[PDB]
Amino acid sequence: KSEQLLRIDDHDFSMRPGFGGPAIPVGVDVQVESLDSISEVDMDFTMTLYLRHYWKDERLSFPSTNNLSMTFDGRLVKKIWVPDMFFVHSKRSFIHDTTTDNVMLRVQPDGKVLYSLRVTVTAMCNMDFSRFPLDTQTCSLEIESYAYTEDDLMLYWKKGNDSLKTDERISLSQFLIQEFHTTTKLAFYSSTGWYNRLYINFTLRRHIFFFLLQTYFPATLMVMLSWVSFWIDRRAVPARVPLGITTVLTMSTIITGVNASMPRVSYIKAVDIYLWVSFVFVFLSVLEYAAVNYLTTVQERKEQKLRDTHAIDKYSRIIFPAAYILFNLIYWSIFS
Amino acid sequence: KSEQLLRIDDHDFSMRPGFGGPAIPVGVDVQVESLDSISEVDMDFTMTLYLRHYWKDERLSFPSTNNLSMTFDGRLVKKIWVPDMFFVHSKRSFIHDTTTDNVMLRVQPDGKVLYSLRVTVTAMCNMDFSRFPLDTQTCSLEIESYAYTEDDLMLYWKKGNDSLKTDERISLSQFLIQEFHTTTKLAFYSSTGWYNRLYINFTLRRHIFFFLLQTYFPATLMVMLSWVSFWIDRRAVPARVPLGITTVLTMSTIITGVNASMPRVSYIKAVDIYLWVSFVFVFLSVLEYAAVNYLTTVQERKEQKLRDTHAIDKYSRIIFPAAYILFNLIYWSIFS
Amino acid sequence: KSEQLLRIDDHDFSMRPGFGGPAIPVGVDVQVESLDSISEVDMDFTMTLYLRHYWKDERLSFPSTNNLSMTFDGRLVKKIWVPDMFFVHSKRSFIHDTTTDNVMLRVQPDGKVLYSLRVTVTAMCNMDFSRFPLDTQTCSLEIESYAYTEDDLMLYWKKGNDSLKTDERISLSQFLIQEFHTTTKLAFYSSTGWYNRLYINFTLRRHIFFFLLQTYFPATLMVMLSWVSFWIDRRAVPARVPLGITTVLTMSTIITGVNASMPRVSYIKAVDIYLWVSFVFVFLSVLEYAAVNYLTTVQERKEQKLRDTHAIDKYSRIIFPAAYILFNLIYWSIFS
Amino acid sequence: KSEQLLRIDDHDFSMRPGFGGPAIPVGVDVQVESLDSISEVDMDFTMTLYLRHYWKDERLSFPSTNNLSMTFDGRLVKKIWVPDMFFVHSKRSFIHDTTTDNVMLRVQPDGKVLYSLRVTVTAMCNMDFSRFPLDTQTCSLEIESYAYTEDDLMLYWKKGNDSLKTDERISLSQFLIQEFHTTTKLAFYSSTGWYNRLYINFTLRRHIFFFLLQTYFPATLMVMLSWVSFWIDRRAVPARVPLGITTVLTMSTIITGVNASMPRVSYIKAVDIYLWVSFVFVFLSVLEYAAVNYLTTVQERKEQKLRDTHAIDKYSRIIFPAAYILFNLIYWSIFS
Amino acid sequence: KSEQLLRIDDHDFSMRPGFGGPAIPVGVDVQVESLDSISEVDMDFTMTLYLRHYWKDERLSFPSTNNLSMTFDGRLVKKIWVPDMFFVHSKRSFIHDTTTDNVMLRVQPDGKVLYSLRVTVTAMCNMDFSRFPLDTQTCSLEIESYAYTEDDLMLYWKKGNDSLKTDERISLSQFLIQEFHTTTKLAFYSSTGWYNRLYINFTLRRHIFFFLLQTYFPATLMVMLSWVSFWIDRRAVPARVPLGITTVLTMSTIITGVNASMPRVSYIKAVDIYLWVSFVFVFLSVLEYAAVNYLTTVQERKEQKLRDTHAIDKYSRIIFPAAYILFNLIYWSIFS
Ligand SMILES: *[C@@H]1O[C@H](CO)[C@@H](O)[C@H](O)[C@H]1NC(C)=O
Ligand SMILES: *[C@@H]1O[C@H](CO)[C@@H](O)[C@H](O)[C@H]1NC(C)=O
Ligand SMILES: *[C@@H]1O[C@H](CO)[C@@H](O)[C@H](O)[C@H]1NC(C)=O
Ligand SMILES: *[C@@H]1O[C@H](CO)[C@@H](O)[C@H](O)[C@H]1NC(C)=O
Ligand SMILES: *[C@@H]1O[C@H](CO)[C@@H](O)[C@H](O)[C@H]1NC(C)=O
Ligand SMILES: *[C@@H]1O[C@H](CO)[C@@H](O)[C@H](O)[C@H]1NC(C)=O
Ligand SMILES: *[C@@H]1O[C@H](CO)[C@@H](O)[C@H](O)[C@H]1NC(C)=O
Ligand SMILES: *[C@@H]1O[C@H](CO)[C@@H](O)[C@H](O)[C@H]1NC(C)=O
Ligand SMILES: *[C@@H]1O[C@H](CO)[C@@H](O)[C@H](O)[C@H]1NC(C)=O
Ligand SMILES: *[C@@H]1O[C@H](CO)[C@@H](O)[C@H](O)[C@H]1NC(C)=O
Ligand SMILES: CCCCCCCCCCCC
Ligand SMILES: CCCCCCCCCCCC
Ligand SMILES: CCCCCCCCCCCC
Ligand SMILES: CCCCCCCCCCCC
Ligand SMILES: CCCCCCCCCCCC
Ligand SMILES: CCCCCCCCCC
Ligand SMILES: CP(=O)(O)C1=CCNCC1
Ligand SMILES: CP(=O)(O)C1=CCNCC1
Ligand SMILES: CP(=O)(O)C1=CCNCC1
Ligand SMILES: CP(=O)(O)C1=CCNCC1
Ligand SMILES: CP(=O)(O)C1=CCNCC1
Ligand SMILES: CCCCCCCC
Ligand SMILES: CCCCCCCC
Ligand SMILES: CCCCCCCC
Ligand SMILES: CCCCCCCC
Ligand SMILES: CCCCCCCC
Ligand SMILES: CCCCCC
Ligand SMILES: CCCCCC
Ligand SMILES: CCCCCC
Ligand SMILES: CCCCCC
Ligand SMILES: CCCCCC
Ligand SMILES: CCCCCC
Ligand SMILES: CCCCCC
Ligand SMILES: CCCCCC
Ligand SMILES: CCCCCC
Ligand SMILES: CCCCCC
Ligand SMILES: CCCCCC
Ligand SMILES: [Cl-]
Ligand SMILES: [Cl-]
């Protein structure tokens, strides 16, 4: 029996190696296999990865006439001491178990141990949509010991920044992913003390041109279309009125359609500001002709009682586009 | 073996400490890690937290030449007595178990015990949407012993209002969160007796300006647009009629779009009252011109058989805006 | 050890108390904590409750110098006989287990037993939507023994109609709940015999005024709007035609929007009958003017070749509203 | 102890009864409790049922002074041999376990055994939507032994067609259910040999009148409405043009609304053919008036330079309805 | 006892057969039962299959007077050595367990073993939607040993390309499936070494004609409809203007409806290019008439102050269709 080469029953494996003395160092490496999904309303993401641990335990040393190591599956884990890592700020997680538990242990003749397992985790990520669709988001995954403070267990990245590897084909449907790197920081709990925490960081960006074409283009086109009425004969009332009211209806249907396709986040975003300013411009173009028609009727009635282009159209033809251009300059200087 | 320092087999751990005498006090602290989601149709919310217990048991005392404590994981829990807390009015819950069970026990030389675990819970919350979008909601999470009455177990907050801590970055996508605090109250069950219950309370609010801009603004603009027809020449029938009918169509599409984006709650809310009153105003503006056209035709026919602005337009130009202003004053005095 | 006060190993607990003789009576009480959700397309509902059992077993009697009882958790259940209740016509269910199994046993000195547990269940409920939105639904939850016929186990409500309690704040988002009560009935299985079955009954209703305002009001308004054309000068063709076609478009958009917001049930309901009759009325109003225009043109051409209000408008002004009123009287006398 | 009346430890229950000789016959009965749901996009359905097995085993015979049988729950199953049935072509399944495992065993004095359990299963069903909404679907559930060929285990329906019972109130929200019956057939696996397979068959149909009223009626009405323009004076251009373009807009909104309410199946169905032919008819009605207006203008210009009803309208008034009637005759002769 | 014919307690089954020498070959066969679902937003697919293993172990040989083999269920697996296969790049998986675990073991007298189990797996598949709806996708499922390198375990397809079988009725609702085949390749891990990997490959395609009819047809029809205005009398302003604005509204509603029915992928696809070019064509047709009307008014005013078809219409009647045809030729030569 291979489990008799390790004196399992001759040691108390409820205590850590080196108990009573200096803390035992534990090194960590991570390989990221895929990014599975992201939820903008609930603000979280899901990842699948391999987690590997390295440490030494003299109680597991065994004699050998060669330098070959012994390999075990997950059934040995319950018989020896292993580190208790957990994921901070996670919502749910599990260890894969088909066709059996995806866990491995390798023991060297001198007592060095490698511990490897495959896991899927869902973690929280606070997001800010104020600058949508030009926003940038930063996310992280955090690893910590549950029960051992830094006086008993010292947790560190085994090879610094070389400890993190990512799959060549990692991708998300609606985002671009960039800038993977690692950091470390100490955390304090008033209940028990100081702990080491490890971080994996990355950044997300959107495809700007899709949103420009889908949203900003039609609204600008409809605003430009509302300016055509300034060049139409003011005596053609049955042509001037329906054009304005139909332009208002078209802009309203565009805004409703755009609202239906964005994530349901109930606060003000940059694209909403652009759309509602455009709507106001279209509304004012109808008020302009109402004023023109009333003044012309008044003048004709006065002339008959006593017995060319109106100035308002001439000024509007210049004033409306200049104001829209100025608004665009200010908007794009503010929101980049 | 560390489990032989505690005389595990020398005591009956199916009975409570102090059995037969006064009740044993148990103190509780809570740390809230995140708020995961909220469901308005099903009326519930989800939270992740750390739960910690404090009590003393003389049967667990062990000799020591120093003042160091001993730490165990979840495997020891089945061998000793622990308190049986559960969450009242919950729908589902679980204890996290990656990479192992997230449970810890620490025992002092004199028998003081700390018991800590990490849990996720979904709890019910009755909501009232009568004042939407200006509504305010209050929610709570409740903790109680399953099997021990106040004569056997005395449950209390360990440090009063200092027993509750919350994460600095706790947030929800569509709500603002404020005013965390704790309370206690006694509950009675006719089957078994009186029990102590602990509460965690907080309040939720919406972003008002987003809803004002998205809903109240367009409806007011369309009502103001329907008043333009009162200043148009009454002889221009092919201009007056299509304008009114198209305004009605636009208002209908706005209301349908707004209904499509709110939570599916099937009873009358304040925003519905505002929208349908506005719709009625638009409808009456079309009836007004129908009456004007009929009366003018009657007069012309009578004059020919025998062989300026109509008064109705003049009165409507004043009466419609004043009534709308009065409705707004009453509405906003009622709904704040 | 408390489990040695009960002679656990001195009895066969695979057989029922009173084996070989008369059936053992078992009394039941229920406390309903909440109603969690309802699904109209799948026709089911979800509930959380406390289930309590009462019976006597002389094999569990123990000596005592007082009248104190002994309390155990779920670990003792596997060592003694307990009743095997299950929920008839259910789709899924589970027993809550945080922070431990929510199960309790209390044993009196003379052998009386109380058995209590907390459970969540999803149960089927056939619904009929013919009269929507004026429909009423009745639902039930059923409890039965799996393996014991009425000759071996007699199941009954412990205190009649006083055995059922409900929470003061029980509610559903889209329904009103009323009339909780209990019944019993005998059921027959050809495979094994007769069994006792217990029932919990309740009724659901909708909020009528919300549906009236959202659906019936706009359709009636559009039908009334289509009657305006009967008072407009028949010589104004470019005003009469667009009005009718735009009214048809508006009614179509209303019907599509209403269909999008109801539960996806694919058979004919009362509200569909009302909407499509209204649509037919709007269609006929356009055919009327087509006939009027053709006849007028024919008359003018005939008069020129040889070289006031048309009767159809005069009759339509009376006939259309009277027919609509008659339809409403018949509809509301049929559907209440 | 009742388990000592059966000599459990005196037999090897890892081998089948009759090992080494002829195959052991096993009879099956099924009772269907409900149909829980159906998914058209994923092509599967869910059912809850009772499964019962009958066979004889002389090793379980016990002496008795009467003819009473002994009953056990699921804990005995692990100690004896039972048949290993599984569901072919299923996606997921489970055995109900509240308040305990829903499993029963009854043993007669001579060794006859009844084995009963309650299960829920989701099974695949390939569907064809070419003739929607006039399609018919056939579904089946299949039962087979995992490890025993027909040389070792003979599986059959215990009472032929009387072995299947269904609940009196079985129903689905959007389908009608008819024609339950059973069949059997032999299946071959190249890895191990021939196996017996049992089938449960049934048929599904839709409610035709709901779909006729919701889809076919409005499209026919709009096609008939487009024919009104053929009777309007050709000199009324501002009446003829807007009518045609608005009819096109209305038909487009109807088609979009209809597409939004059907299951998302991305290939051509019969109702799509009907809708797009109707759309083409509406388009051609606008081209007709364009031609008429151009020809009239040409004639007037020619007459002035040199210095009644147009034939196209007269022919269209006859030709359009006859072609639509012919299309309807062909369509309904093809699709029933 | 059949488990005593195999000397289970006489061997260490924590080590592989042939330990210390050449690697043990393991052959694999696969039978695919169904394809359950596909998710375009999350980029994954789900499959159900049978997995079979073949190898030899002299420690399991048993004496026999015949050539009959012995069969066991899943309970024996924990007592002997078996290979540890797992699925690479998977998100979740499980082994079916109704009515018991779907696992079988067959052992020949000379020690040959067959190991069979039924499993469901969800696997990732990166997709590219640039050419939608004319895109083609390729997917794969991968199998590998967790803990044994190629020096200890040699994994191969048992019968080459004949090792893969697929069900005759395998189908997906929205895709066509073709070209199943197998491959193999060696993979390197810096942590432990070289491993053998097996692949199952297949291809997916869409139904092109459904998308052509639903999307490309209406847009082309509306572009052709906008050209009618070039043949209408330029003096009929109240006919020319509303036609153009209503055509713009119709095209906008078509684009919104089409966007609502495609998978929510936020980057530019081929069908979007076609739709927005068509929209631009419709917009330019309105600008054309604006210019014509202004120039005519200028000429009339000049002539009166001093006291036929306009050229722009004549050129547009030719230029617009030729440009649209050229765009179509380029588009369909690029996108096939
Ligand atoms: C390799 O094995 C030899 C014995 O064959 C041993 O003497 C030597 O120390 C080993 N080397 C290492 C680096 O373990
Ligand atoms: C790894 O590189 C990143 C690059 O930004 C740096 O921030 C980080 O500190 C580095 N970590 C180590 C351990 O070198
Ligand atoms: C600390 O340990 C010393 C022994 O070194 C002991 O005498 C003393 O009582 C301890 N103090 C406390 C507060 O436990
Ligand atoms: C904590 O403070 C809140 C503040 O509202 C108060 O309501 C509550 O009673 C306080 N509880 C304790 C234990 O002081
Ligand atoms: C209460 O306890 C006393 C012993 O102190 C006993 O004699 C008496 O019978 C008990 N009464 C009941 C109702 O059990
Ligand atoms: C309880 O009251 C209801 C009231 O309708 C009645 O139907 C039922 O029979 C009563 N049951 C008992 C046990 O009294
Ligand atoms: C019924 O029981 C009697 C003994 O009382 C026995 O002799 C007889 O064979 C039994 N009959 C059957 C059909 O089992
Ligand atoms: C049961 O009846 C159906 C009726 O169609 C028939 O197809 C089937 O063969 C019958 N089976 C038996 C076992 O009689
Ligand atoms: C078949 O069984 C006979 C014994 O009856 C044996 O001698 C022979 O070797 C067996 N053949 C094979 C191919 O196993
Ligand atoms: C199986 O056939 C496919 C056909 O493309 C080929 O690519 C593959 O290499 C073949 N594999 C074997 C093992 O013959
Ligand atoms: C509330 C946070 C600042 C956002 C201010 C936006 C103002 C938008 C005005 C648009 C008027 C149509
Ligand atoms: C039913 C609870 C009181 C709500 C009353 C609202 C009345 C709204 C009338 C709107 C008419 C258009
Ligand atoms: C099919 C069950 C009876 C329902 C009959 C409704 C008839 C509706 C006719 C509406 C015509 C527009
Ligand atoms: C592709 C399978 C045959 C379906 C043929 C339908 C043709 C529809 C033409 C409709 C034109 C508007
Ligand atoms: C961004 C990847 C190349 C896509 C270029 C498409 C340009 C579309 C222009 C449409 C104008 C209406
Ligand atoms: C396919 C041609 C579309 C434009 C035709 C306009 C009608 C011209 C009538 C002579
Ligand atoms: C045992 P605790 O003080 O609750 C704790 C400390 C750090 N890791 C998380 C849990
Ligand atoms: C044992 P019970 O009387 O059902 C009970 C009492 C208080 N906690 C919940 C359960
Ligand atoms: C054992 P059975 O005859 O299948 C049965 C009888 C009554 N309860 C449900 C199950
Ligand atoms: C053991 P197998 O050859 O994989 C098999 C045969 C028939 N039932 C399903 C499984
Ligand atoms: C044990 P490992 O080096 O993490 C590994 C190697 C190949 N299969 C997956 C896991
Ligand atoms: C009318 C669009 C103006 C865009 C100007 C952009 C300035 C950076
Ligand atoms: C037309 C809008 C009137 C708003 C008045 C608000 C009174 C508090
Ligand atoms: C036009 C609406 C008529 C409503 C009459 C109601 C009769 C009960
Ligand atoms: C205009 C509808 C014609 C329907 C004819 C039906 C022939 C079976
Ligand atoms: C107006 C449609 C033109 C289609 C041409 C297709 C060229 C391959
Ligand atoms: C919209 C502005 C009108 C200006 C009238 C003087
Ligand atoms: C836009 C305002 C113009 C005023 C000219 C008198
Ligand atoms: C809408 C009110 C009309 C008033 C006619 C006297
Ligand atoms: C709005 C009613 C006006 C009546 C004037 C005679
Ligand atoms: C819609 C009915 C028309 C009547 C013509 C005589
Ligand atoms: C509505 C029909 C009127 C007929 C009058 C001649
Ligand atoms: C269900 C029949 C209703 C009839 C309404 C006139
Ligand atoms: C739509 C057909 C027009 C016929 C012109 C000759
Ligand atoms: C519909 C075509 C009519 C042609 C008459 C000359
Ligand atoms: C849309 C192009 C107009 C050309 C005016 C010269
Ligand atoms: C489309 C441009 C035409 C210009 C003719 C002068
Ligand atoms: Cl006109
Ligand atoms: Cl018009």
Side-chain angles (χ1 to χ4, degrees), chain A residues 50-161:
Chain A
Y50 299 92
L51 183 65
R52 306 188 172 103
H53 313 75
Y54 300 83
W55 78 96
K56 187 177 180 176
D57 197 342
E58 286 77 9
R59 294 175 294 179
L60 299 175
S61 179
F62 59 93
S64 178
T65 57
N66 48 75
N67 292 327
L68 295 169
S69 51
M70 296 192 298
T71 297
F72 307 86
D73 66 2
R75 291 183 292 265
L76 185 71
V77 175
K78 290 300 178 183
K79 297 180 177 63
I80 67 174
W81 181 94
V82 294
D84 61 341
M85 296 302 107
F86 84 105
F87 295 96
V88 194
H89 294 105
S90 56
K91 298 182 182 184
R92 65 188 83 97
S93 55
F94 65 90
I95 295 169
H96 296 257
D97 65 348
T98 294
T99 60
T100 189
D101 289 342
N102 294 17
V103 180
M104 199 273 304
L105 278 172
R106 185 183 73 187
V107 186
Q108 301 288 326
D110 59 347
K112 289 177 180 176
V113 185
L114 161 68
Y115 180 40
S116 171
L117 58 164
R118 188 174 179 257
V119 70
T120 289
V121 58
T122 300
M124 60 171 288
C125 179
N126 286 336
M127 307 178 186
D128 187 347
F129 299 114
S130 285
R131 298 171 60 83
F132 180 94
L134 289 86
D135 49 321
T136 308
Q137 317 291 343
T138 56
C139 333
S140 67
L141 185 74
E142 312 173 32
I143 302 173
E144 181 187 293
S145 169
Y146 196 85
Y148 297 98
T149 64
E150 64 160 0
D151 294 321
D152 292 306
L153 194 162
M154 202 280 293
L155 188 71
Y156 70 102
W157 289 110
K158 186 176 188 58
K159 298 184 299 299
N161 231 338

Side-chain angles (χ1 to χ4, degrees), chain E residues 29-178 180-243:
Chain E
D29 288 338
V30 166
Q31 175 185 333
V32 181
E33 186 165 58
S34 69
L35 283 173
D36 302 324
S37 53
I38 181 169
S39 166
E40 283 172 313
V41 181
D42 291 325
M43 308 197 287
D44 51 70
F45 67 90
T46 306
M47 180 191 297
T48 305
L49 60 136
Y50 299 92
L51 183 65
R52 306 188 172 103
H53 313 76
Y54 300 83
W55 78 96
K56 187 177 180 176
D57 197 342
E58 286 77 9
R59 294 174 294 179
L60 299 175
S61 179
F62 59 93
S64 178
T65 57
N66 48 75
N67 292 326
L68 295 169
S69 51
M70 296 192 298
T71 297
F72 307 86
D73 66 2
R75 291 183 292 265
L76 185 71
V77 175
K78 290 300 178 183
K79 297 180 177 63
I80 67 174
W81 181 94
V82 294
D84 61 341
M85 296 302 107
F86 84 105
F87 295 96
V88 194
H89 294 105
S90 56
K91 298 182 182 184
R92 65 188 83 97
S93 55
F94 65 90
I95 295 169
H96 296 257
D97 65 348
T98 294
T99 60
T100 189
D101 289 342
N102 294 17
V103 179
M104 199 273 304
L105 278 172
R106 185 183 73 187
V107 186
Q108 301 288 326
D110 59 347
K112 289 177 180 176
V113 185
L114 161 68
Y115 180 40
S116 171
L117 58 164
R118 188 174 179 257
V119 70
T120 289
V121 58
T122 300
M124 60 171 288
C125 179
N126 285 336
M127 307 178 186
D128 187 347
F129 299 114
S130 285
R131 298 171 60 83
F132 180 94
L134 289 86
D135 49 321
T136 308
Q137 317 291 343
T138 56
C139 333
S140 67
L141 185 74
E142 312 173 32
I143 301 173
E144 181 187 293
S145 169
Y146 196 85
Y148 297 98
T149 64
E150 64 160 0
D151 294 321
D152 292 306
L153 194 162
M154 202 280 293
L155 188 71
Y156 70 102
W157 289 110
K158 186 176 188 58
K159 298 184 299 299
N161 231 338
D162 294 322
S163 292
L164 174 67
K165 303 301 183 181
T166 55
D167 191 281
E168 296 85 352
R169 296 179 63 183
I170 178 170
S171 58
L172 281 167
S173 193
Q174 76 278 47
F175 288 102
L176 297 167
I177 314 160
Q178 48 184 100
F180 277 98
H181 66 282
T182 68
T183 52
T184 72
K185 193 185 180 186
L186 282 174
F188 176 76
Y189 291 78
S190 72
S191 53
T192 40
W194 291 94
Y195 295 76
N196 288 282
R197 194 179 290 181
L198 310 182
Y199 296 76
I200 299 176
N201 308 280
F202 58 95
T203 303
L204 304 171
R205 294 182 186 276
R206 302 184 195 273
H207 302 272
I208 307 298
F209 289 116
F210 171 79
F211 288 102
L212 291 174
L213 174 69
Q214 288 289 345
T215 302
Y216 289 82
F217 190 55
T220 302
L221 288 176
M222 296 310 303
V223 166
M224 284 183 298
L225 211 51
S226 80
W227 296 339
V228 159
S229 57
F230 299 148
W231 305 80
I232 297 178
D233 198 337
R234 56 161 159 170
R235 292 173 297 173
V237 196
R240 294 281 294 263
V241 178
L243 170 64

Side-chain angles (χ1 to χ4, degrees), chain B residues 225-233 240 243 285 288-289 313:
Chain B
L225 211 51
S226 80
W227 296 339
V228 158
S229 57
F230 299 148
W231 305 80
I232 297 178
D233 198 337
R240 294 281 294 263
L243 170 64
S285 79
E288 185 261 359
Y289 180 68
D313 280 332

Side-chain angles (χ1 to χ4, degrees), chain A residues 1-2 31 33-34 36-37 48 50 52 71 75 94 96-100 102-104 106 114 116-118 120 167 169 171-174 207 209-211 213-214 217-218 221-222 225 228 231-233 238-239 243 246-247 249-250 253-254 257 261-263 317, chain E residues 12 14 40-44 51 78 83-95 115 117 119 124 126 129 146-147 189 191-192 237-238 241-242 245-246 248-249 252-253 256 259 264-269 272 276 279-280 283 286-287 290 293-294 297:
Chain A
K1 200 176 183 184
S2 60
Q31 175 185 332
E33 186 165 58
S34 69
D36 302 324
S37 53
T48 305
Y50 299 92
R52 306 188 172 103
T71 297
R75 291 183 292 265
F94 65 90
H96 296 257
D97 65 348
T98 294
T99 60
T100 189
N102 294 17
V103 180
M104 199 273 304
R106 185 183 73 187
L114 161 68
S116 171
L117 58 164
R118 188 174 179 257
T120 289
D167 191 281
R169 296 179 63 183
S171 58
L172 281 167
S173 193
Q174 76 278 47
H207 302 272
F209 289 116
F210 171 79
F211 288 102
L213 174 69
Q214 288 289 345
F217 190 55
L221 288 176
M222 296 310 303
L225 211 51
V228 158
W231 305 80
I232 297 178
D233 198 337
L243 170 64
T246 310
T247 305
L249 169 60
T250 307
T253 63
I254 285 176
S261 75
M262 286 181 304
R317 288 175 187 176
Chain E
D12 184 10
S14 62
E40 283 172 313
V41 181
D42 291 325
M43 308 197 287
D44 51 70
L51 183 65
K78 290 300 178 183
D84 61 341
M85 296 302 107
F86 84 105
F87 295 96
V88 194
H89 294 105
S90 56
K91 298 182 182 184
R92 65 188 83 97
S93 55
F94 65 90
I95 295 169
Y115 180 40
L117 58 164
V119 70
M124 60 171 288
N126 285 336
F129 299 114
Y146 196 85
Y189 291 78
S191 53
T192 40
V237 196
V241 178
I245 188 62
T246 310
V248 173
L249 169 60
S252 181
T253 63
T256 295
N259 285 335
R264 299 186 57 192
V265 182
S266 298
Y267 56 77
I268 292 173
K269 308 173 288 296
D272 307 318
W276 289 106
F279 189 85
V280 166
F283 169 90
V286 176
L287 287 198
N293 182 81
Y294 181 71
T297 298

Side-chain angles (χ1 to χ4, degrees), chain D residues 12 14 41-42 85-86 88-91 93 124 126 146-147 191 245 252 259 264 266-267 276 283 290 294, chain E residues 2 33-34 36 52 96 98-99 102 116-118 167 169 171 173 210 214 218 225 228 231 246 254 261:
Chain D
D12 184 10
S14 62
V41 181
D42 291 325
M85 296 302 107
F86 84 105
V88 194
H89 294 105
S90 56
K91 298 182 182 184
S93 55
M124 60 171 288
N126 285 336
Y146 196 85
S191 53
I245 188 62
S252 181
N259 285 335
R264 299 186 57 192
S266 298
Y267 56 77
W276 289 106
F283 169 90
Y294 181 71
Chain E
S2 60
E33 186 165 58
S34 69
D36 302 324
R52 306 188 172 103
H96 296 257
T98 294
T99 60
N102 294 17
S116 171
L117 58 164
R118 188 174 179 257
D167 191 281
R169 296 179 63 183
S171 58
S173 193
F210 171 79
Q214 288 289 345
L225 211 51
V228 159
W231 305 80
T246 310
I254 285 176
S261 75

